[PDB]
Amino acid sequence: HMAISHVQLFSVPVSDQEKAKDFYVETVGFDLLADQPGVHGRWLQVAPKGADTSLVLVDWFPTMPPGSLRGLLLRTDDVDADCARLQERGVAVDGPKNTPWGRQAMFSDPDGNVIGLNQPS
């Protein structure tokens, strides 16, 4: 068996990092983990409070254009209240809808990356 424990982090392609920081931290409610120099420029890292896996808001992978990400799903304990909060903050939300795999909604970040919310049935 391998010694891998979990995904430490993955990357979300953004164009404007200040606008992405403000979206993920203020609108979506993530903690800011880091905002500091990195190897290809500004390293901006965010995550839900307490979570093992974080997100890096980067602009330096040509194969990942800003806004190209899909199929990112966030677990929430209250999808209905989260959707209402997003809507109050000016975000267009699709759903929530009951699905076979939980009650789910979708929304986009400022670049067009698509983010899902899922609350178990």
Residues at the site binding ligand 9VG, with contacts judged by CB under 6 A: 11, 34, 36, 38-40, 43, 56, 58, 70-73, 99, 101, 104, 106, 114-116, 118
Phi/psi at 83 (5° precision) = -60, -40
63 binds a second copy (CB under 8 A): yes
53 binds a second copy (CB under 8 A): yes
The β-bridge relationship of strands 54-58 and 31-38 is: unpaired
Compute the distance between CA of residue 78 and CA of residue 101 in angstroms, rounded to an integer: 15
Size of interface with a second copy, in residues (CB under 8 A) = 47
> How many other C-beta atoms can be found within 10 angstroms of the C-beta atom of residue 49?
8
92 binds a second copy (CB under 8 A): no
